[PDB]
Amino acid sequence: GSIRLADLAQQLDAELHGDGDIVITGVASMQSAQTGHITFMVNPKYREHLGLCQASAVVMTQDDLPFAKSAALVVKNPYLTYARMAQILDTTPQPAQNIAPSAVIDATAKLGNNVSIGANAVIESGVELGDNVIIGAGCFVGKNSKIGAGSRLWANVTIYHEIQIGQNCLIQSGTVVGADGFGYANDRGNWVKIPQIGRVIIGDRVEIGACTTIDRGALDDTIIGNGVIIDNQCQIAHNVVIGDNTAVAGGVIMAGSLKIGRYCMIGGASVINGHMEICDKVTVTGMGMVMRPITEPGVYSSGIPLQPNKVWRKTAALVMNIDDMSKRLKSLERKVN
Amino acid sequence: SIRLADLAQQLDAELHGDGDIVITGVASMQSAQTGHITFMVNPKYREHLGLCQASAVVMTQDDLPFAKSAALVVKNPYLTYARMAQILDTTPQPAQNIAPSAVIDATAKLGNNVSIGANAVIESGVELGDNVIIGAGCFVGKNSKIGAGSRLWANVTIYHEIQIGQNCLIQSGTVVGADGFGYANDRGNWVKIPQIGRVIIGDRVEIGACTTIDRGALDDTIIGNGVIIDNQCQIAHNVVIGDNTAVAGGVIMAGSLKIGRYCMIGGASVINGHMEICDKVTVTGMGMVMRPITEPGVYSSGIPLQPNKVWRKTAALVMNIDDMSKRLKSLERKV
Amino acid sequence: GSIRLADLAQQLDAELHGDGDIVITGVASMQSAQTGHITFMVNPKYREHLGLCQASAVVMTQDDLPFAKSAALVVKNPYLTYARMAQILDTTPQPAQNIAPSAVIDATAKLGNNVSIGANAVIESGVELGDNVIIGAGCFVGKNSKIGAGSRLWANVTIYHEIQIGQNCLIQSGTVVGADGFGYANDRGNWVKIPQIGRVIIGDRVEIGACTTIDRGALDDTIIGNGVIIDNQCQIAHNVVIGDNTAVAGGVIMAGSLKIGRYCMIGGASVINGHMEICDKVTVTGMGMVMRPITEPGVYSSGIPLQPNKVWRKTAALVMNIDDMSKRLKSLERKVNQQ
Numbered sequence A: 001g002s003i004r005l006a007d008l009a010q011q012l013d014a015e016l017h018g019d020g021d022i023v024i025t026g027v028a029s030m031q032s033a034q035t036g037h038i039t040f041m042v043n044p045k046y047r048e049h050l051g052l053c054q055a056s057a058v059v060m061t062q063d064d065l066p067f068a069k070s071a072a073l074v075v076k077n078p079y080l081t082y083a084r085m086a087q088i089l090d091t092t093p094q095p096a097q098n099i100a101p102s103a104v105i106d107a108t109a110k111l112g113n114n115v116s117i118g119a120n121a122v123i124e125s126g127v128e129l130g131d132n133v134i135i136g137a138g139c140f141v142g143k144n145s146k147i148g149a150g151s152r153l154w155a156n157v158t159i160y161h162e163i164q165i166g167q168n169c170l171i172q173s174g175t176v177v178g179a180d181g182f183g184y185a186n187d188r189g190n191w192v193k194i195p196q197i198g199r200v201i202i203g204d205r206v207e208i209g210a211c212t213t214i215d216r217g218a219l220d221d222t223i224i225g226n227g228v229i230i231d232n233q234c235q236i237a238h239n240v241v242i243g244d245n246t247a248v249a250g251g252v253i254m255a256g257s258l259k260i261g262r263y264c265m266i267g268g269a270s271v272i273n274g275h276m277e278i279c280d281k282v283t284v285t286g287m288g289m290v291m292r293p294i295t296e297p298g299v300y301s302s303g304i305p306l307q308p309n310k311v312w313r314k315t316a317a318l319v320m321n322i323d324d325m326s327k328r329l330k331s332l333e334r335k336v337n
Numbered sequence B: 001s002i003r004l005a006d007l008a009q010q011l012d013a014e015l016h017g018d019g020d021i022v023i024t025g026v027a028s029m030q031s032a033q034t035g036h037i038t039f040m041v042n043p044k045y046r047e048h049l050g051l052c053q054a055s056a057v058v059m060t061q062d063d064l065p066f067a068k069s070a071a072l073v074v075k076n077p078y079l080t081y082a083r084m085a086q087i088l089d090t091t092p093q094p095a096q097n098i099a100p101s102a103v104i105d106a107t108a109k110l111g112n113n114v115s116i117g118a119n120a121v122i123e124s125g126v127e128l129g130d131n132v133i134i135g136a137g138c139f140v141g142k143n144s145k146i147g148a149g150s151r152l153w154a155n156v157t158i159y160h161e162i163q164i165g166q167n168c169l170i171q172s173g174t175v176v177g178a179d180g181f182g183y184a185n186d187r188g189n190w191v192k193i194p195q196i197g198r199v200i201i202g203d204r205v206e207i208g209a210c211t212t213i214d215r216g217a218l219d220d221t222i223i224g225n226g227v228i229i230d231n232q233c234q235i236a237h238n239v240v241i242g243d244n245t246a247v248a249g250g251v252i253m254a255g256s257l258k259i260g261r262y263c264m265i266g267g268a269s270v271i272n273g274h275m276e277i278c279d280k281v282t283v284t285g286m287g288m289v290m291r292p293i294t295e296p297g298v299y300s301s302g303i304p305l306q307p308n309k310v311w312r313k314t315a316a317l318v319m320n321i322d323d324m325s326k327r328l329k330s331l332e333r334k335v
Numbered sequence C: 001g002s003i004r005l006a007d008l009a010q011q012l013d014a015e016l017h018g019d020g021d022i023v024i025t026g027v028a029s030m031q032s033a034q035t036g037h038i039t040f041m042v043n044p045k046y047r048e049h050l051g052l053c054q055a056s057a058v059v060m061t062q063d064d065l066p067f068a069k070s071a072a073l074v075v076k077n078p079y080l081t082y083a084r085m086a087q088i089l090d091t092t093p094q095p096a097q098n099i100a101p102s103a104v105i106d107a108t109a110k111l112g113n114n115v116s117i118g119a120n121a122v123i124e125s126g127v128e129l130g131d132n133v134i135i136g137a138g139c140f141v142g143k144n145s146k147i148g149a150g151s152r153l154w155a156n157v158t159i160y161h162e163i164q165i166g167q168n169c170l171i172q173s174g175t176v177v178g179a180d181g182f183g184y185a186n187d188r189g190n191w192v193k194i195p196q197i198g199r200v201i202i203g204d205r206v207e208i209g210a211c212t213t214i215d216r217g218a219l220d221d222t223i224i225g226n227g228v229i230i231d232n233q234c235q236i237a238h239n240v241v242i243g244d245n246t247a248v249a250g251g252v253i254m255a256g257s258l259k260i261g262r263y264c265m266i267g268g269a270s271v272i273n274g275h276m277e278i279c280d281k282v283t284v285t286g287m288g289m290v291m292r293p294i295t296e297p298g299v300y301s302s303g304i305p306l307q308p309n310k311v312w313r314k315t316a317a318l319v320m321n322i323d324d325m326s327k328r329l330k331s332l333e334r335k336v337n338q339q
Ligand SMILES: COc1ccccc1OCC(=O)N(C)[C@@H](c1cccs1)c1c[nH]c2ccccc12
Pocket: A253, A254, A255, A256, A271, A272, A273, A274, A289, A290, A291, B248, B249, B264, B265, B266, B267, B268, B282, B283, B284, B285, B286, B300, B301, B302
């Protein structure tokens, strides 16, 4: 939906320098922007390049203004303003509009105002959908689960039974919330299933990427705090608790009963042991092997990175035989002393 | 709801308390209220049992003196907990009866008391045994057979010519029987090898969510009886998993791997193919399995987490460990 | 499906030795093959074993021929011939046939000739499906997405909006193409979602496995080249670019804005970080931890393999304390240097 540059600047709390009557149709990268587009500059090295940008307007700082070759929106934080103006001008469609005739909705489900449910979605008994909730095509929402106002599920999302999801969440396709945790007792080598009768509680403003799995708790609950962001294909095991505003990048695997504090950042492909705690304000870099609890804030890392194969072969053999190397060092220390 | 005396009988536990107590469900020790039964395994909880508000606590004999409520004595409280949770299970069924929106090929063979959920799709030639439950939105491909008592949750995908035994359970998002990753090369161009093998899943198999089990190239991918597989796992074509083996979340297996019985593969492990792991092998989390394993026991790999400042130095020295080795050899020669 | 051996041999450009009138009904492994099956031998150690194989015909080399105990098709490359003959005798069914009445298709969708759409699939407005496209049951294809002629989706595949897929592609079930990239800004300690309005562009002859995810770009596009093959459980982040004919094995994770060249081979469970480039003809072995750009072709590797747990505990402790070992070595060198 087009907008006048002056009106866009007002909504962004930005200082307009140029023609307020310019009509902005959408956001584009600096290299792709054309007439009608607004873009942004975060790297002052592109000041000399602005004359090569064909956008109708550019978001920049006060220091950048003398280098402009277009209408400019001056702000303190061009990146944040970019996020805000991309939401104003978002072209992303909704997962559904209205309630599709092919959706199958139990008579006991409770629908709020302005709820949309896509084709062939399945809503179980007792489900409660808040105002403005959107359920994509082909989703399944299990018995008695509740989804808060403004939350949206893309196509082919699976929500099991007794799940609680807060307001203004966003869940991408393929995600499964509330499957059985990996709970079994061993009986003379045979695995005896332990029913998982806990739930999943997801807070407000949670975003979950595609094909992520969040299992329900065994007795008490798996809990996702407010404002948490989770990338694609993470495994959040039963009775994991993730604190508010924590970010979990793609492909992270967590074991059961792990507690992650608030304000943490878990890098992609990390692996985290269970029945332990990570305190607030912890950053684990990508592929971290998290075996022990983390009790102090800060940045933690693991992994021996890539080498040419010929070189790696020796690195690996030497590390595997490092005990012998250690004994040789000690022996030579004694001989010299 | 069940009387404590009757529950203790079905669990073969010795009752120490009022058997007329009504038990309505299971709860954790910290959450239990009147009417709940709970359990304890770690002796550290003996001391605040007076604070637990459960109507009954499953415990061992040595725990009995510390009991502050009715108690059921057993040898293995965790196994008894498993059993009593099944008796008191509240989990609903994926479906009940056959939904009008389900699309079922007329040549499908359905046993007695088969339930198929809304908008599930059943292909031609499919055979569903007695008491099988198919969740909403599932797909079951041509000529696949699912044994009596087995259950699929919503949005499970079974390809064609798949065989699943009795009393299995498959969680949502899982895909059984996709093409294995098989290709020939014709001057840099990948040439697809059709994957016309199958997947054979035994009895009492439980598979997690968003797990993938590829069909074999010519012969079959085989999952033994009693196997349990967690979420986000990849089981490549022609993998064979022995009975009662457990695979934790996020495990990736390459093609033609053979795993024995009673194994335990820790989460996020990576197991390479065309090799065998013997019975009774445990691989700890993130294990990097490159070589065959021929002796039972516990195996591990990986350098664990350190503070970033410390890790920088560790990784740099490790990557230059060959120079360290050469310097040590030189020093030995000089001395 | 069934074919005379002589005709099969002709289509494979193979030299027939034996009865061309034999009727071949399918392909089977050497151990499983029975009458009517054709099989193949790539390992000459099985020459002594051919008398135990009950296939009606065996594909082999000229050097193998004296060891045959059946009709033989002689070729230069038995493995490639096996791929070709398995395609000829393929028993894999199609994901769908015709347009299912339970499918929900927007009136503005444009369908080519001989399109098939499986039961309960959902096709959004503006979608374009090329000739001979097959959409499996339960799929979702989002607004304005385009799927090229001959391309096929198995059941329960999710294609978001504004996605472009080329010709003769194949996508296995549970895969998600075009979900939001992992993009967020920071407003005084609060995550602010960055709309991901780029796309995914997939070329021709691309094969993608099951439960793989390929996110759309933030502004510009995530791009998959022609002839690329991608295994199960892979994660391709926003704005990744993959060059033609590259192969990505199962469970690989690629972070945002990674560019991978042509003819690369990425081993299973590798982790490739973003905002960097990997040149043509690079092989990364399994579980490789890629933190830096790769500018020369060749084979690269990382990882310390498995050991018995008691041994690993000692290895891990010594490695974690390697800075102390380095300092002791340097001290000893000074002593040996008489300083
Ligand atoms: C050197 O060991 C480690 C290295 C890193 C993490 C943990 C490590 O030790 C603990 C461990 O291995 N587990 C708890 C595994 C097993 C459970 C039973 C047998 S193995 C596991 C299961 N589900 C999981 C999900 C994620 C991660 C691990 C698991």
